[PDB]
Amino acid sequence: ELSFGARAELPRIHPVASKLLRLMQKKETNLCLSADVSLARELLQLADALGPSICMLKTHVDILNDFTLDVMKELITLAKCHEFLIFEDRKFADIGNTVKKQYEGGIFKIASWADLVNAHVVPGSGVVKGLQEVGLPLHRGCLLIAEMSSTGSLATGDYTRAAVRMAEEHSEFVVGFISGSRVSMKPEFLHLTPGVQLEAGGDNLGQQYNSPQEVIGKRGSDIIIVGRGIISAADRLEAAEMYRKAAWEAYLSRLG
Amino acid sequence: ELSFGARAELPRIHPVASKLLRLMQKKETNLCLSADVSLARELLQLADALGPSICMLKTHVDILNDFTLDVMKELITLAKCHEFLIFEDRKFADIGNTVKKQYEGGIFKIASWADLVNAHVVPGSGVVKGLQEVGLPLHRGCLLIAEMSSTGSLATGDYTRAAVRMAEEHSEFVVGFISGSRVSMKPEFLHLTPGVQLEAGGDNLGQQYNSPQEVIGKRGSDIIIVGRGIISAADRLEAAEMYRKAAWEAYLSRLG
Ligand SMILES: NC(=O)c1cc(=O)[nH]c(=O)n1[C@@H]1O[C@H](COP(=O)(O)O)[C@@H](O)[C@H]1O
Ligand SMILES: NC(=O)c1cc(=O)[nH]c(=O)n1[C@@H]1O[C@H](COP(=O)(O)O)[C@@H](O)[C@H]1O
Ligand code: PRO
Ligand code: PRO
């Protein structure tokens, strides 16, 4: 098993994956903040304060009450200053002709500002081919949803295997997974795991939590995605630091 | 097998399904227009001209270059005038806590104007429970994606069975399916089928077409969803009429 810095240099690495792995190693962070907020000012204040602690900021642009492209310009300034990627959790999930338009156009213009997006694999590989027509010219990357954290997830067994094959067959554009565990044996792919909290439990609507030690250390994932465990805390910076230190030490211990 | 008008009166019918089935019977239309356009003016001109020919207008609000809530006010005026439902093809596809926010909030405020939305079932039933927290108070309905039209679709076998169970167990809010065929034996549920064109073929990005006669007549679906077969034609009104007459006669012949 290679360090994040050595994985950044692998022959088949995607440039977006390489940039991410290099800043993960430099900053000693494998934490992705899930910035599930409704106010642009709160998104930007979190991005600025937590930027040094995170390798990535996951957005849901469609829950911002005051979205504008100027907000995303300000977010890019912070991502460049603090060195983290912007991942829009769009969950593209239809035929290629549709998702192509959803990625480039509309009021969000997601491909213009998002380093990473993700897709569900349920439509078959046309979802990736459609996104790649916009993403490859813009030097972007994509994550495929191979497993989900929620109760009753159908992203199991042959579904998960199909996501891994689709990723491995589209390595020009697909850089990794949303998953609960390592699902690819190829070290060029990133594994990002949501459903993470320091304490046991869940929510009222099917979310299930596992710890950073479990996710990174035992299940072999690379990055934890954390929303409410940070966002609902009083001191979001200290919370982010606790999650960062947990995920980083779990990674170091696994690497030995 | 009951007529659309008799299905509208079934004891367990959802009010949104009842309204739809009644206007389908009144207008002799089981056509849903897929208005996959980038300009508000084109969306509204299509809605006005084709409104009499359709039971439903499917939107992708996120590909409109000039979305505003005032556009959706003008669309509602046309839906009321011509009697069709508005279905936003949002493909909600994550944990309940996230989709709840995506449905009510953000710049689109989808629940404020969409009679129907749809969801992927991959996250498990929390996707429905989250949407229902916003949709049930607003008297809205939801469709679950049980099958997909595209090459390599993973919405097959046990996945499809899980979608049908999730619908049948959430009948207060779920009114039907996106599917290629009848998947529920319960007549209170609507079946809407995309991937429809009069001529054989597909597209360059995994779309596959079947005819209205095949979809409605042999596969037992209720409604055809048609985009490019209408939208790319020179005379969109005549194209809509050809699709309407095809789907309506296939329905009549199956009913006998
Ligand atoms: N698409 C994902 O990353 C995703 C896939 C999945 O299986 N499970 C899951 O929790 N997520 C997304 O990650 C975030 C979790 O937020 P939290 O529960 O930590 O507040 C939240 O934004 C949620 O939408
Ligand atoms: N979500 C759906 O309705 C859906 C599910 C699915 O399996 N297959 C599918 O084609 N659709 C959506 O229907 C529309 C088809 O557009 P067309 O190919 O007729 O131009 C287009 O807007 C596409 O996104
Ligand atoms: O010098 C570095 O940071 C990288 C890490 C692996 C080898 N070179
Ligand atoms: O009169 C009608 O239109 C409805 C249809 C079934 C029975 N009553």
With a CB cutoff of 8 Å and minimum separation 6, the contacts of B245 are none
Among left, alpha and beta (phi > 0; psi -120 to 50; other), residue A195 is: left
**CB atoms A107 and B105 under 8 Å:** no
Experimental method: X-ray
Q: What is the CA radius of gyration of chain A?
A: 17
Q: How far apart are CA A103 and CA A114, in angstroms?
A: 10
Q: How far apart are CA B81 and CA A20, in angstroms?
A: 53
- One DSSP character per residue, chain B reads ---HHHHTT-TT--HHHHHHHHHHHHHT--EEEE---S-HHHHHHHHHHHGGG-SEEEE-GGG-TT--HHHHHHHHHHHHHHT-EEEEEEEE-S-HHHHHHHHH-TTT-HHHH-SEEEEESTT-THHHHHHHHHHTTTT-EEEEE----STT----HHHHHHHHHHHHTTTTTEEEEE-SS---S-TTSEEEE-SB-SSS-B-TTS-B-B-HIIIIIIS--SEEEESHHHHTSS-HHHHHHHHHHHHHHHHHHHH-
What's the angle, vertex CA B143, arms to CA A145 and CA A176, rounded to 5? 5
Contact at 8 Å (CB) between A194 and A206? no
Facing A125 at nearest CB: one of B98, B145, B152: B152
**CB atoms B106 and A65 under 8 Å:** yes
Facing A154 at nearest CB: one of B38, B105, B159: B159
**Cα B72 to ligand 3 centre (Å):** 53
The three-state secondary structure class of A159 is: helix
**CB atoms B106 and A62 under 8 Å:** yes
Q: How far apart are CA B131 and CA B152, in angstroms?
A: 28
Provide, as residue numbers in chain A, all residues whose Cβ is less than 8 Å from the Cβ of B121: 154
Q: How far apart are CA A115 and CA A111, in angstroms?
A: 8
Residue A3: Cβ-neighbour burial (10 angstroms; 0-12, 13-18, 19+): middle
Per the listing, tokens 């529920």 go with B184
Q: How far apart are CA A4 and CA A254, in angstroms?
A: 12
Which of B63, B100, B101, B128 to probe by mutation at the A interface, max A CB count within 10 Å? B63
Q: How far apart are CA B126 and CA A218, in angstroms?
A: 27
Contact at 8 Å (CB) between B58 and B91? no
Ligand showing the shortest atom-to-Cα distance for residue A2: 3
Q: How many CB atoms lie within 10 A of CB B81?
A: 12
Task: Write down the architecture of domain A4-255 according to CATH.
Answer: Alpha-Beta Barrel (3.20)
Among left, alpha and beta (phi > 0; psi -120 to 50; other), residue B24 is: alpha
Q: How far apart are CA A108 and CA A104, in angstroms?
A: 8
What's the residue count for chain A? Answer: 256
The three-state secondary structure class of A26 is: helix
Q: How far apart are CA B225 and CA B202, in angstroms?
A: 15
Give residue limits of the domains in chain B: 4-255
Q: Where are the beta strands (DSSP E) in A129-249?
A: 141-145, 174-178, 190-193, 223-226
* Residue B91: active-site member: yes
Contact at 8 Å (CB) between B166 and B121? yes
In chain A, the residue whose alpha carbon lies closest to the alpha carbon of B66 is: A107
What's the angle, vertex CA A147, arms to CA A223 and CA B125, rounded to 5? 125
Q: How far is CA B80 from the centre of its chain?
A: 17
Ligand showing the shortest atom-to-Cα distance for residue A228: 1
User: Mind spelling out the 3-state secondary structure of A44-91?
Assistant: HHHHHHHHHHCCEEEECHHHCCCCCHHHHHHHHHHHHHHCCEEEEEEE
**CB atoms A101 and B38 under 8 Å:** yes
Residue A83 phi, psi dihedral angles, 5° rounding: 70, 75
With a CB cutoff of 8 Å and minimum separation 6, the contacts of B151 are A124, A125, A126, B202, B206, B208
Which of B95, B148, B196, B203 to probe by mutation at the A interface, max A CB count within 10 Å? B95
Per the listing, tokens 């459609």 go with A130
Facing B150 at nearest CB: one of A95, A159, A205: A95
Written as six digits, the tokens of B151 are 């090459």
Provide, as residue numbers in chain B, all residues whose Cβ is less than 8 Å from the Cβ of A130: 205-206
What's the angle, vertex CA A33, arms to CA A27 and CA A39, rounded to 5? 130
Q: How far is CA B4 from CA A120, B83, B178, B179, in A?
A: 34, 16, 18, 18
